[PDB]
Amino acid sequence: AQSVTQLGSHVSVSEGALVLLRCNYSSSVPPYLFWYVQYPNQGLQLLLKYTSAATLVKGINGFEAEFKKSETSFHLTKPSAHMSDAAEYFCAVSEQDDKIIFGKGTRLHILPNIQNPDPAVYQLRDSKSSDKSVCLFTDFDSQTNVSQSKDSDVYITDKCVLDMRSMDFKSNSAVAWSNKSDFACANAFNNSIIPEDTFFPS
């Protein structure tokens, strides 16, 4: 009868904006509630929990959650999204006086503030003396997204954000490649809607 619901397997937030991850529960009597965070290939870390004491529960790193009985909710918040907040978050609830049951999880994706976009498609050559290449689409802002390949012999990755600490600089990129010698970087991202000002060097 008792459950916990998180909707949206993947959610976005702009860098520096309010973080809000939603959790609702179905228990008739108020339960204990928990929020855990997980980084890739790591274990679970407790952020905060409601244990029938304070209703505004504070957590580590500026996280908070308010237990609201009348709308059966325990939403997790943080005032400002940082790149290091990128992780998967699980809401969980007590059940049957003997266990914790977990929500399905939500992965939080932080959209970096790219104030000087410089979209471009580059060709990169193998360090060894094959004439193998890959294609790198980089330096586009938040309004561009990368579509999957329409050709089973052309491989295209999801966009990935890197954070160069040395220059306090973040950028988006996707990589494409193909085992066809004729494949060209000018055409690699033709199934994606790319910026009209994308740089294509020759």
């Binding site: 274990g43 266990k99 977990f102 471009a120 580059y122 360090s127 089973s152 990755t157 740089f199």
Partner: protein
């Protein structure tokens, strides 16, 4: 470390009995085994409140457990099947929902060990056009042709591991999506200043830890036995 799990990683063929161990030092009555799958969270398999008291969770089929001591709770896959591929977590709890999780067991069950294959790894050097346009330089690592999907990629600059300026794909892609036993590929980027790439004294290495066969596994093919191993590729900086 209060809660410890073994093994940390394992690959197995289908139809084998597999045992995972959880041990604790605090002697809490309550111990639990969960599995984690993408999009499903953590699902309870079995739990125990004392030595010989056992309770099914939501996904107990295909599994058994034994509580051999206050300190120990064992999970068995009775006859492993591919859909038992998962990250497995044991936990203890005190009397007030104070949970402690073990660090996890990554288990991969494959139908046919003959398909196991380590990656080929290549580094692709920064474009002169990126360098001129941006005064930055992105290296790309590609790991290809590996099976199963069970790898760890890292970057090493002048012999030390780096995290800054790196982005690795969160999941490998299938090279042949139509096939149940497709091999996989994975990419990563490491971005540095153009100045740093242009120094011929700087050394860049992409490392891929692959988890495959063990010494005990049989191997009847001519090609290299695809054991757990590290495969790297490298590049030196360059002015031209």
């Amino acid at each position: 470390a209060d809660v410890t799990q073994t093994p940390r990683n394992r690959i197995t063929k289908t139809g084998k009995r597999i045992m995972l161990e959880c041990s604790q030092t605090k002697g809490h009555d309550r111990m639990y085994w969960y599995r984690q799958d993408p999009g499903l969270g953590l699902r309870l398999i079995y739990y125990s409140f004392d030595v010989k008291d056992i309770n099914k969770g939501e996904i107990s089929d295909g599994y058994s457990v034994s509580r051999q001591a206050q300190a120990k709770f064992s999970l068995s896959l009775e006859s492993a099947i591919p859909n038992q591929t998962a990250l497995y977590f044991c936990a203890t709890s005190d009397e007030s929902y104070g949970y402690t999780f073990g660090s996890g067991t990554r288990l991969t069950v494959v139908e046919d060990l003959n398909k196991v294959s380590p990656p080929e790894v290549a580094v692709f050097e920064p474009s002169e056009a990126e360098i001129s346009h941006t005064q930055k330089a992105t290296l790309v690592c590609l790991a290809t042709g590996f099976y199963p999907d069970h790898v760890e990629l890292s970057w090493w600059v002048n012999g030390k591991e780096v995290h800054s300026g790196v982005c690795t794909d969160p999941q490998p892609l299938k090279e042949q999506p139509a096939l149940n036993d497709s091999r996989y590929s994975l990419s990563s980027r490491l971005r540095v200043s153009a100045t740093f790439w242009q120094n011929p004294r700087n050394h860049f290495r992409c490392q891929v830890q692959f988890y495959g066969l063990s010494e005990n596994d049989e191997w009847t093919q001519d090609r290299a036995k695809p054991v757990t191993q590290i495969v790297s590729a490298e590049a030196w900086g360059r002015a031209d």
